[PDB]
């Protein structure tokens, strides 16, 4: 009962330690080690892929450094693979069926530790910037799964990868009442934000910053402000440890597999035969149920993607060019106590707070009787209007849209206001509150949740779109209350009862 | 002067190749088709890649089409990797070439063919609108692309005036599957799966008791796989489309792909002076392939030949194909229903095919008891709380919108 195993490896020392691990796992049932070099070119790897498949006794292939032009052939023959040096999340789609049971996580799984940062903090003023990529989109859906249970502050910020364009986009992020920044992009976009946030002073006091691992490189390290807390995967480079553990897992698998029925070996050679070798996925099912008690990298176990079961995370703080290792994340167990945290504002403590503003934007539409949009005077002021008792009625600036007429979006008009609820807000701001800002909506609609035609999106329009997008903060309007608007938006007590 | 290969694997009609091949329809614009014929018999994708590399794809021919007769899936990956490394176009004609519906990155090319699954979902609604019959249940397997057309069709019904409803979408892959199939009360069960999956589910659903007479199934051809078999368990009178390539045969699809290559070549060469040369070695180019940001799919996506705009999407799905709707038979594997061609539905007899509960009711319109409106011009059907009329065209399908007290 001798079983061959291929392993696409870079140097011969790897193939030597592969052969020695085969002889060590031959303690139980015999094994066999064939040596596969790592090809420098893609089509040459697709050339030499099935010259090793002449030996049909290969039942698993280890790969290393993209391994795209070789992983498809193994999933085409349903061979269980291990992608050892994979930090790419495109293979995490297991609907391709050219994937593997996971080693160390590709990139996005550190965001679970980012969700466990609120176990230290319980912060709920958190802004997220995503570079627009599929791996970023997978991290988006990962965070949306992580939130469903709080730190439920702000939706998203989008970013187009390939341009600089930070300040023109994210100048709004200076104003959005929150201090927690989470970066998820490439290292070059990280340096672009680093220099633009240096231009915008967005890495000052209060501003706490959270990054991942692949943003941390020397180009970004020159531009990283001293105080950023960074992550690092335990055993990112000890490849031979993952080699020997992979030999022990496949030896556990073939230990279970040599006590089974209907072996039905692959064809010798890649071709000249059928390609629907049926015990392929069943061996992957056995590898899915295969476990590992303990290794040099620890206890290797498998999640639904096969992922590594509290992959430990060394955490560093860049303090005066030196990444001071803050301590070890181990799942439920936290970075305990040992090292002092320097924060990016010269601070020594965690900023437990945010900036509740005394300036909020109250945007609404024109509605007689409660709103009479009046044209301003020659100096832009208001005509002094009296009551029936001669009392000066409060005319505040209802800053209009760029329309004087719908279809001429040019006349950004001051249009100081006149109406019933104007004095109500004057009463409330006298009693409790602040110096407001007032805008008038362009389309003038209440707005319904109309279906956008872009593969099943449904977006609120009008003021409901504006408040949901954060363009407005308080909506005073003669608007009724249905369940539909109440599905997402908090309503106050109903002031004027009507029919 | 464009070196073109046409490549097949078995069952060739070489005289239709010799005959189609009309130089006068390529009437001296800028290019002439330097055509070469290859025939194979391989189940050998490795030697398929290697000898084609060894052929004039490295030496002479810059553009090639390819046909099959099988049901293979990895031909998609063979397409994707040659698109990944070589700007030379390969096209899909028949067999496991037009059965390739696979999502990909922004590629250099695609096995361009007829319809999509989104066009099949729409015509499935158009048939359920025309033949007055109502979907309420879908089932799917873990095939990538299941949920988009599901969310499409359900949201499309949510914007119409009259409305189909939905019992359940069953994302599936323990024989209590029969108990989840017990909850399906719709006359229509739509399904996304494979042919071996379909035959297994046909054993399961006939073990439920929801067989071919009570609750009829509706597939696309990808679920049917090969359109020329009843493997084990196909129930009578099921519904499917691929299908106009069956009306084509060989030399119509030869005239399709050849003239599309020659036209889109003259599309570029209408004002461009030349064409990029084929690279001398496929697996050792590695410096000359980056000389061309290719971008000729601007000219490949918009090609009209003989007044027929063979226009694709970004994923090479044809925007204007023809759809032939076909029923099964108790004894045969497919017979007929009718056809579909770009928002034009032509079906046979306007009679729901069947195998007493129904009673033919004769009546006269008298308000307020009977009110006959016409159908809506946007859809062609009746609204909520209205029923279809049947009055003799003096075919009898003048069909109007009856209602009333």
């Amino acid at each position: 009962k001798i079983v061959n195993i291929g392993a696409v490896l870079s140097t011969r020392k790897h193939e030597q330690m592969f052969r020695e691990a085969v002889n060590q796992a031959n303690k139980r049932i015999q094994l066999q080690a064939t040596s596969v070099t790592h090809k420098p070119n893609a089509i040459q790897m697709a050339l030499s892929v099935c010259e090793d498949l002449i030996s049909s006794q290969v039942y698993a292939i280890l790969v290393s450094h993209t391994p795209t032009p070789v992983s498809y052939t193994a999933g085409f023959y349903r061979i269980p693979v291990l992608g050892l040096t994979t930090r790419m999340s495109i293979y995490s789609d297991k609907s391709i069926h050219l994937s593997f049971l996971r080693t160390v996580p590709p990139y996005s799984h550190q965001s679970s530790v980012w969700f466990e940062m609120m176990r230290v903090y319980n912060w709920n003023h958190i802004i997220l910037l995503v570079s627009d990529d599929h791996e970023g989109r997978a991290a988006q859906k990962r965070l949306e799964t992580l939130l469903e249970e709080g730190p439920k502050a702000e939706k998203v910020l989008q970013f187009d990868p390939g341009t600089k364009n930070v300040t023109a986009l994210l100048m709004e992020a200076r104003e959005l009442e929150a201090r927690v920044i989470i970066l998820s992009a490439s290292e070059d976009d990280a340096a672009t934000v680093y220099r633009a946030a240096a231009m915008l002073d967005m890495t000052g006091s209060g501003y706490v910053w959270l990054v991942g691992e692949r943003e941390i490189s020397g180009n970004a390290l020159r531009y990283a402000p001293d105080g950023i807390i960074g992550l690092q995967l335990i055993n990112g480079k000890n490849e031979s440890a993952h080699i020997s553990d992979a030999v022990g897992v496949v030896a556990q698998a073939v230990h279970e597999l040599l006590e089974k029925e209907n072996i039905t070996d692959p064809p010798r050679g890649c071709v000249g035969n059928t390609n629907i070798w049926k015990t392929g996925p069943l061996f992957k099912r056995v590898l899915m149920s295969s476990k590992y008690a303990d290794g040099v990298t620890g206890r290797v176990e498998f999640n639904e993607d096969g992922d590594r079961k509290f992959a430990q995370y060394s955490i560093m703080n860049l303090q005066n060019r030196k990444l001071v290792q803050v301590g070890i994340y181990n799942g439920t167990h936290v970075i305990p106590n040992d090292r002092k945290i320097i924060w990016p504002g010269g601070e020594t403590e965690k900023p437990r707070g945010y900036q509740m503003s005394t300036r909020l934007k109250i945007v609404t539409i024109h509605q007689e009787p409660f709103v009479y949009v009046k044209p301003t005077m020659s100096d832009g002021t208001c005509k002094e209007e009296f009551t029936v008792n001669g009392d000066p009625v409060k005319k505040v600036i209802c800053t209009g849209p760029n329309d004087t007429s719908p279809g001429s979006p040019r006349h950004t008009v001051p249009q100081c206001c006149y109406g019933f609820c104007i004095d109500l807000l004057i009463k409330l701001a006298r009693t409790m509150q602040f110096t407001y800002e007032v805008h008038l909506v362009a389309d003038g609609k209440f707005g319904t949740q109309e279906r956008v035609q872009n593969s099943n999106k449904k977006e609120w329009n009008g003021m409901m779109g504006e408040l949901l997008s954060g363009q407005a903060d308080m909506i005073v309007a003669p608007l009724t209350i249905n369940n539909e608007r109440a599905q997402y938006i908090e309503f106050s007590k109903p002031f004027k009862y009507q029919g | 002067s464009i070196g073109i290969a046409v490549i097949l694997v078995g069952t060739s009609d070489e005289v239709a190749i010799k005959d189609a091949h009309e130089k006068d329809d390529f009437h001296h614009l800028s290019v002439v088709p330097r055509v070469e014929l290859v025939a194979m018999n391989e189940t050998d994708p490795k030697s398929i890649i290697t000898r084609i590399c060894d052929l004039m794809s490295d030496r002479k021919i810059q553009g090639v089409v390819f046909a099959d007769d099988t049901d293979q899936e990895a031909i998609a990956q063979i397409l994707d990797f040659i698109s990944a490394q070589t700007l030379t176009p390969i096209l899909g004609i028949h067999g496991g070439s037009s059965m390739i519906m696979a999502d990909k990155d922004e590629s250099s090319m695609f096995f361009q063919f007829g319809p999509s699954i989104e066009q099949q979902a729409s015509v499935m609604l158009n048939i359920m609108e025309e033949y007055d019959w109502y979907i309420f249940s879908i089932v799917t397997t873990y095939f990538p692309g299941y949920q988009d057309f599901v969310n499409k069709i359900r949201s499309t019904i949510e914007n119409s005036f009259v409305g189909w409803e939905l019992e359940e979408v069953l994302l599936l892959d323990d024989s209590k599957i029969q108990n989840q199939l017990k909850k399906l009360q719709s006359p229509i069960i739509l399904l996304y799966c494979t042919k071996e999956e379909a035959t297994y589910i046909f054993e399961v659903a006939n073990s439920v008791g929801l067989t071919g007479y009570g609750y009829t199934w509706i597939v696309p051809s990808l679920v049917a796989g090969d359109t020329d078999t009843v493997p084990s368990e196909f129930p009578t009178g099921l519904i499917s489309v691929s299908y106009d390539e069956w009306d084509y045969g060989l030399p119509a699809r030869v005239r399709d792909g050849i003239a599309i290559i020659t036209t889109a070549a003259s599309d570029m060469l209408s004002e461009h002076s030349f064409i990029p040369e084929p690279k001398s070695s496929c697996y050792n180019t590695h410096e000359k392939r980056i000389y061309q940001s290719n971008m000729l799919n601007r000219y490949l996506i918009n090609v009209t030949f003989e007044g027929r705009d063979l226009s694709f999407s970004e994923d090479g799905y044809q925007m204007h194909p023809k759809l032939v709707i076909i029923l099964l038979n108790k004894e045969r594997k497919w017979e007929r229903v009718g056809k579909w061609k770009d928002k034009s539905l032509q079906m046979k007899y306007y009679v729901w095919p069947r195998m007493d509960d129904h009673l033919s009711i004769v009546t006269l319109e008298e308000a307020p008891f009977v009110i006959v409106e016409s159908v809506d011009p946007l859809s062609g059907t009746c609204m909520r709380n209205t029923v279809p009329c049947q009055k003799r065209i003096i075919p009898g399908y003048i069909k109007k919108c009856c209602k009333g007290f």
Partner: antibody, heavy 114, light 112 residues
Framework: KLQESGGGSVKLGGSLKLSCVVS????????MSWVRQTPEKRLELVAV????????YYPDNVKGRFTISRDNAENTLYLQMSSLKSEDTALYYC????????????WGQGTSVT | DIQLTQSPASLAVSLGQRATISCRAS??????????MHWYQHKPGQPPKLLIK???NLESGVPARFSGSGSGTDFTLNIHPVEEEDTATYYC?????????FGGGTKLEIKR
């Protein structure tokens, strides 16, 4: 690398040979051009060639008023114009093109055709 | 025919500024995944080369005091900050299928 050779003053409706010495690269696989710079700085076209000698292309208004010949061994392009009117008094630039190649990577200094 | 036009064709700003130069045309040319215009810049008389290939792709031996963006029928270039050797005329080129489409030219000086 590239240096425009000739130009000068031409009469109305006259013919002129426009030459350009090339040093540094080969002709039979590479791609060059000829563009026009007016005294009003309106960028126009003179000559469109192939990358391998091959064929050429003619801009529409100047079509039939010039011909192109590529002597690939001696690395100097030739361009014989004809019927030069008053609306061709412009500085002409020879420029090597890209591998795409509708951009230009290298340039000549510039001839002056009056 | 598509026709590129440049704005503003003549100006002069001081040192260390955001010198943004826009270019307009009729039809959208930048569609699939690459943008389409090659910014040329050179002094009067001398041909300094291309500086931007498609939208921001810098060439060999270029400064870092400029950038280029834009899409649809409106691309632009933005010099920021402003150098002292900025007495040159700047140019636009994406052609078409249709042989070659050119823009005008933007001559810039340094305020002092």
């Amino acid at each position: 690398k590239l240096q425009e050779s000739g130009g000068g003053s031409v009469k109305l409706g006259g013919s002129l040979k426009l030459s350009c010495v090339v040093s540094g690269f080969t002709f039979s696989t590479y791609y060059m051009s000829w563009v026009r710079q007016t005294p009003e700085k309106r960028l126009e076209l003179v000559a469109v060639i192939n990358s391998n000698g091959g064929n050429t292309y003619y801009p529409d208004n100047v079509k039939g008023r010039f011909t192109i010949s590529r002597d690939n061994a001696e690395n100097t392009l030739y361009l014989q114009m004809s019927s030069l009117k008053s609306e061709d008094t412009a500085l002409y630039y020879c420029a090597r093109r890209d591998y795409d190649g509708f951009a230009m990577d290298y340039w000549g200094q510039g001839t002056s055709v009056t | 025919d598509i026709q590129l036009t440049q704005s503003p064709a003549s100006l002069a700003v001081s040192l260390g500024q955001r010198a943004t130069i826009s270019c307009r045309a009729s039809q959208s040319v930048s569609t699939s995944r690459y943008s389409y215009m090659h910014w040329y810049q050179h002094k009067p008389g001398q041909p300094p080369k291309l500086l931007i290939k498609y939208a921001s792709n810098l060439e060999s031996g270029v400064p870092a005091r400029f950038s280029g963006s834009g899409s649809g029928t409106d691309f632009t270039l933005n010099i920021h900050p402003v150098e002292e050797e900025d007495t040159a005329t700047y140019y636009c080129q994406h052609s078409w299928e249709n042989p070659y489409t050119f823009g005008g030219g933007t001559k810039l000086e340094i305020k002092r």
